[PDB]
Ligand binder design. Structure first.
Ligand SMILES: Nc1ccn([C@@H]2O[C@H](COP(=O)(O)OP(=O)(O)OP(=O)(O)O)[C@@H](O)[C@H]2O)c(=O)n1
Ligand SMILES: Nc1ccn([C@@H]2O[C@H](COP(=O)(O)OP(=O)(O)OP(=O)(O)O)[C@@H](O)[C@H]2O)c(=O)n1
Ligand SMILES: Nc1ccn([C@@H]2O[C@H](COP(=O)(O)OP(=O)(O)OP(=O)(O)O)[C@@H](O)[C@H]2O)c(=O)n1
Ligand SMILES: Nc1ccn([C@@H]2O[C@H](COP(=O)(O)OP(=O)(O)OP(=O)(O)O)[C@@H](O)[C@H]2O)c(=O)n1
Ligand SMILES: [Cl-]
Ligand SMILES: [Cl-]
Ligand SMILES: [Mg+2]
Ligand SMILES: [Mg+2]
Ligand SMILES: [Mn+2]
Ligand SMILES: [Mn+2]
Ligand SMILES: [Mn+2]
Ligand SMILES: [Mn+2]
Ligand SMILES: [Mn+2]
Ligand SMILES: [Mn+2]
Ligand code: NA
Ligand code: NA
Lengths: 437, 437
């Protein structure tokens, strides 16, 4: 519909509506009231302060700024004291060091203790960096706030906004740096078409170069990769999306697809056509935060995938899902059944002592020499991937993540067929198999 | 029964019986008569001349010895003239250059034209070497002829006597050199227990050393490996047999096992227990000699094995058989059926031009990105190893040996099940699968 027209139309999917802006205003004003009456030194930072927050994602970030000659113990204790004093309800959270999360007039707020430092290079952790992040962007981002929201909304609609482990995508700070570097959403998208996995974007130097990994240099700290948490595959997906958008721009790129909502019969038919074994490991979700859970699910899934590969079941893809009560590790394999008999490698023929040992073992079939080496026919203890995974998960749960594996130890189920389809995983199965509309 | 007693008893399985020795005598005397009346210069060589021929393997080797100033054309023409003149019936054969094979008083004879040379180093091919082979052994082998027959009979009973391609074992000349080097059958067997695939036996130097390959140095020509045609696996089998013999000597080692003679029902049951796909490629035997046929069968079998491996059917072993009218390439695979769907590798995400091409193709399922690279689900044209080989043999017969592949082009059949068992291959199947008694 013309790119410039589509971007005009996309602003309404992306700019927060009216009662959200005022809901934030009322919370901000009230929070300021309460902080001011305590005489605390503070700064509002982040996307609220800069008016770059995406529609639906209202949250306020306040950093408490303390004298440089407070101890690290003194800053944390007093910081949490104030944190608790000014929020309606509160929780003591952790990202690297403690902060307080809570609510003010219905709006989520983080209050974070850090050092007040004139000029950086006195940084200790990411915490003390953050006031400098706001400082750097405040005023470079002025007049570009809707460009930021366009980029955020584009990424969100395509499932790659957020640096948290469940997503492994683009952080808010990364988005604002990109907008400063390229000047607009449109220019970011046009240029991202030529990004590679070796692209280094150095904002402070106005420079793009090549390096070992995709790296977006923090203009406040040259050692920090702002894009650290962006996965290789989400980078690839973004580059491709940028290419697709420019070739045929549409408002559709700013709107999430409503899920496939497939009937168990159609999935049964798809699985029949592909001729694969499709199954899931079901177990109880451990009570840990997403940033801990998701890496364990990734690990568990890979270890089982690697097991299926090693055992010659020719796994195609895996996926995973956490519902409220259960987790699911999903697998599709090209082999439904393998033979009972396999080949065990023995010693080189010269090695008399070890040959004697190899041949000592009772077997149904006679060992043979092939290419200078002994081999034996021996028998598998499982012939399907489901039987294999039942054995693996029963015996090797110690390698499936601390909490995920402990859960699997207490209870797991292998589910396939019309049964697997009853679980809340059909969406994920359809994606894994590349099912079309 | 005591080793020295067993060897005494083995002499009667190995020394030619009475009417064989005299049948040879009568043929030798008659051949001498006919050669002498032509005034031809000749020498009887080989195992007949040295009284080292195994029981049942009577054949006479005569080399016609010509002046050194005959041409290579003159020696071949005149050599075949005499060859034809003195044998009862004859055929013009080929090993490297032509010779005559025929019969005298019921006994097979080869007559071979070569140069009469005083001292070697004037050799042209293997042909002119052979009089020197006899010269070297005549008299070193005296009193050791029964040691040679013991070794030959031991190897024959275990299927590894003969350097021809069907066997890839030990030649007669190799056996006699071994006896000279070690002094006896028993000492050859004791010492062969420590042979490796790098063992070099240098008869003329009285030396065993290490080298790149198993090598038995011809005492008449230091560049010639007398054991050239011995396969690695037959070497391994001999070393193992030597170890087994010394641990528990028996007359059984000089007696061929009578074949397994299995019933189709028992093989059906074995195949069921193993859970494999067992099948054969049947085609008409081309009319070529064994030394040409067997390498082609080996090649055809390997190419199809490599195909089965490449196509993820997990072949265990292969074998082959030639009957009078047909050839059979036999296979056992761990996968009976693979899924319809597989994964096709596409380009790296950066490569826009090739990504566009990869994604252009119509497919039932959507391609995906994994680890920085595109992949597509696509569909196999076969899901069993039998269907795969029908396709491979139909399309790639050009790679299955000149004559074997041409035969397969005209006609082949894939056979499995109660059908495969009707063919004269059950012996070979039982060996391939390591079936016990
Ligand atoms: N684990 C974290 C979380 C945040 N930050 C920093 O804290 C500030 C605010 O973080 P965040 O709320 O995630 O970013 P926003 O810009 O406010 O974006 P959003 O709208 O998604 O909240 C940023 O300067 C960021 O670099 C960080 O270093 N490490
Ligand atoms: N490269 C590999 C990986 C493992 N395995 C086999 O698979 C088993 C499980 O390996 P893994 O899946 O990595 O599970 P862990 O519990 O991490 O391994 P382990 O029990 O040996 O500590 C191993 O014990 C080993 O016998 C193997 O043969 N070769
Ligand atoms: N293709 C061949 C065949 C034979 N020879 C030589 O010809 C002679 C006789 O060969 P052969 O008949 O195979 O050996 P025998 O000692 O007579 O043993 P056998 O009892 O098996 O016939 C030997 O010196 C051997 O080295 C050769 O060089 N190349
Ligand atoms: N290392 C290999 C071997 C072969 N193949 C595929 O398998 C086919 C057959 O290969 P081969 O069994 O070696 O048969 P040839 O007839 O010898 O090969 P070609 O038809 O390519 O000349 C090839 O065309 C190729 O597509 C492959 O992908 N990779
Ligand atoms: Cl910030
Ligand atoms: Cl000889
Ligand atoms: Mg926040
Ligand atoms: Mg001969
Ligand atoms: Mn924020
Ligand atoms: Mn919070
Ligand atoms: Mn383990
Ligand atoms: Mn001979
Ligand atoms: Mn002959
Ligand atoms: Mn081909
Ligand atoms: Na187990
Ligand atoms: Na074909």
């Amino acid at each position: 519909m013309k790119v410039e027209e589509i971007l005009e139309k996309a602003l309404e999917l992306v700019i927060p509506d009216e009662e959200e802006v005022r809901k934030g205003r009322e919370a901000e004003e009230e929070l300021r009231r309460r902080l001011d009456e305590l005489g605390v030194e503070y700064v509002f930072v982040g996307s609220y302060a800069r008016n770059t927050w995406l529609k639906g994602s209202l949250e306020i970030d306040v950093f408490l700024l303390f004298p440089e000659e407070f101890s690290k113990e003194e800053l944390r204790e007093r910081g949490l004291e104030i944190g608790k004093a000014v929020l309606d309800s509160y929780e003591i959270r952790y990202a690297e060091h403690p902060y307080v999360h809570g609510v003010v007039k219905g709006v989520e707020v983080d209050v974070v203790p850090c050092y007040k430092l004139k000029e950086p290079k006195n940084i200790k952790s990411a915490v003390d960096r953050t006031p400098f992040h706001h400082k750097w962007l405040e005023g470079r981002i002025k007049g570009k706030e809707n460009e930021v929201r366009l980029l955020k909304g584009f990424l969100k609609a395509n499932g790659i906004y957020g640096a948290e482990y469940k997503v492994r995508g683009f952080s808010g700070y990364l988005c604002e740096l990109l907008i400063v570097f390229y000047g607009s959403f449109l220019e970011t998208v046009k240029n991202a078409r030529r990004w590679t996995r070796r692209t280094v974007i150095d904002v402070a130097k106005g420079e793009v170069r090549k390096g070992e990994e995709f790296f977006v240099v923090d203009p406040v700290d040259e050692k920090r990769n702002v894009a650290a948490n962006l996965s290789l595959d989400n980078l690839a997906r973004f580059v491709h999306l940028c290419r697709e958008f420019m070739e045929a721009p549409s408002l559709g790129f700013f709107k999430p697809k409503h899920p496939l909502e497939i009937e168990p019969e159609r999935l049964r038919k798809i699985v029949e056509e592909r001729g694969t074994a499709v199954f899931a490991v079901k177990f109880r979700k451990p009570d840990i935060v997403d940033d801990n859970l998701y890496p364990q699910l990734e690990r568990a899934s890979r270890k089982i995938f690697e097991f299926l590969e090693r055992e010659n079941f020719m796994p195609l893809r895996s996926a995973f899902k956490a519902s409220e009560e259960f987790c699911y590790l999903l697998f599709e394999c090209q082999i439904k059944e393998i033979s009972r008999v396999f080949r065990r490698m023995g010693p080189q023929f010269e090695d008399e002592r070890n040959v004697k040992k190899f041949l000592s073992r009772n077997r149904a079939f006679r060992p043979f020499i092939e290419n200078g080496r002994w081999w034996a026919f021996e028998m598998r203890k499982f012939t399907t991937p489901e039987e294999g995974v039942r054995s693996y998960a029963s015996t090797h749960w110690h390698t499936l993540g601390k909490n995920v594996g402990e859960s699997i130890r207490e209870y797991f189920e292998i589910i396939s067929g019309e049964k697997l389809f009853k679980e809340p995983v059909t969406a994920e199965l359809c994606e894994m198999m590349g099912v079309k509309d």
